[PDB]
Design a protein around this ligand. Structure first.
Ligand code: 2JA
Length: 186
């Protein structure tokens, strides 16, 4: 459809790989650096400054300061996940709420069927079908972050007219221990 035919004409396809140095020690980054899973217990890793030590988050290796970009994430049959972008300057040590005011622009799924935007307050999304693959789209200049069902091209959510100042990283978060991973499409 139009989604497939037009996406690269309008947005530059980002080749996003996960940065193991940023991943919470309870997270496992795959060898090919496209997939993330959760461990039963935290691994023994350094608390280097780049690492999220409280939030179960991991970042992409590269950030954006301009232009239009997109990447796709296979969420599959996961019951829980949150993806989007965050500012380079987010608090990585300890806890703050993942909201736009704290530099996080994400949406996702909890409890198998509760789709929401991580905002203050959180807003519930009504999706006609559960997405298996999600397209994340960034237009830095217009300040739009948009999410689409990457299979049927249907709209999921758009953060509108954000005045971005900082560089933006792709961000990924998983809380649950389940057999299906969260995977970036190349
Ligand atoms: C406290 C907990 C789940 C709630 C996570 P949270 O309070 O940051 O809520 P969220 O950021 O998913 O809207 C147990 O992992």
């Amino acid at each position: 459809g139009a989604y497939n035919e037009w996406k690269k004409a309008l947005f530059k396809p980002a080749d996003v790989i996960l940065d193991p140095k940023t991943a919470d020690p309870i997270l496992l980054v795959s060898e090919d650096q496209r997939s993330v899973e959760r461990a039963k217990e935290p691994q023994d890793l350094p608390d280097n400054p780049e690492r999220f030590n409280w939030h179960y988050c991991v970042l992409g290796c590269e950030s954006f300061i301009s232009g239009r970009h997109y990447w796709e994430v296979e969420v599959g049959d996961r019951k829980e996940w949150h993806i989007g972008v965050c500012s380079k300057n987010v608090q990585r040590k300890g806890w703050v709420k993942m909201t736009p005011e704290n530099g996080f622009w994400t949406m996702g799924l909890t409890d198998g069927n509760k789709y929401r935007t991580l905002t203050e307050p959180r807003t519930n999304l009504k999706l006609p079908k559960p997405p298996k693959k999600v397209g994340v789209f960034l237009d830095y200049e217009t300040g739009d972050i948009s999410f689409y069902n990457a299979v049927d091209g249907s709209h999921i959510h758009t953060f509108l007219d954000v005045s971005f100042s900082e560089a933006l990283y792709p961000v990924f978060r998983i809380l649950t221990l389940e057999p299906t991973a969260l995977t970036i499409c190349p």
